[PDB]
């Protein structure tokens, strides 16, 4: 709406769109693949957050708290871009269910992950709506242990109204794209939970591996 809003979005797309590349059965190692990958994301996500107007500001236990439990949501959101409807798959190489199921993940955590990716793909969002949406997803007042709850719900709001404005301007004939999108955050709370139950499942396997992963996923 405001040129201010518009330049902030542009800086965000750029912010994403550059973060978005620093670039990377005995076959357990299939799993330890998936592992290698999720680290690359976790990296990118902190990389993105830092660049957000306000994020270094907060107490770093806050910016920890926010990074720690936004991570899958964001990683699910990107898995959702990066998804190919004909392949029923996710990307020069790509990722089936049977692939997901080939590492140890072999439950339906998998089916949720994939059902979500077809729903978000259909929205047919672009680079702006996605980053916008990741930035809302990160400034969730309600994560576990967080000092400045008003600060967070507050930097949230900036992104929220930017997107409401952005959508109003650009989806002139489909204004329910906004609460439609906004609401994926809700579905994102369920997926994330299904991911803990996934993490829980094989930690009785044992596996845990990666220090970083056990650090966010508090193992």
């Amino acid at each position: 709406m405001s040129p201010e809003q518009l330049g902030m979005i542009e800086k965000l797309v750029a912010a994403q769109q550059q973060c978005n590349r620093r670039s990377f059965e005995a076959r357990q190692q299939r799993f330890a693949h998936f592992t290698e990958l999720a680290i690359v994301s976790v990296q990118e996500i902190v990389d993105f957050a830092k660049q957000l107007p306000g994020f270094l500001q907060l107490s770093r236990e806050d910016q920890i708290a926010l990074l720690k439990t936004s991570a899958i949501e964001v990683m699910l959101l990107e898995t959702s871009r990066r998804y190919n409807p004909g392949s029923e798959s996710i990307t020069d190489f790509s990722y089936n269910r049977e692939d997901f199921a080939k590492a140890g993940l072999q439950v339906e955590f998998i089916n949720p992950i994939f059902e979500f990716s077809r729903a978000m793909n259909e929205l047919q969002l672009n680079d702006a709506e996605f980053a916008l949406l990741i930035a809302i997803s990160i400034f969730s007042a309600d994560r576990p242990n967080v000092q400045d709850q008003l600060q967070v719900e507050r930097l949230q709001h900036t992104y929220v109204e930017a997107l409401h404005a952005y959508v109003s301007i650009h989806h002139p004939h489909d204004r329910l794209m906004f609460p439609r999108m906004l609401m994926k955050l809700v579905s994102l709370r369920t997926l994330s939970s299904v991911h803990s139950e996934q993490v829980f499942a094989l930690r009785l396997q044992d596996k845990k591996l990666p220090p970083l992963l056990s650090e966010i996923w508090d193992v």
């Binding site: 976790v42 990296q43 902190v46 990389d47 830092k50 770093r60 910016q63 920890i64 990074l67 720690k68 220090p211 970083l212 650090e215 966010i216």
Partner: peptide, 10 residues
């Protein structure tokens, strides 16, 4: 608390 603090202060 940790490998994060390193990704963060950086």
């Amino acid at each position: 608390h940790k490998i994060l603090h390193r990704l963060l202060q950086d």
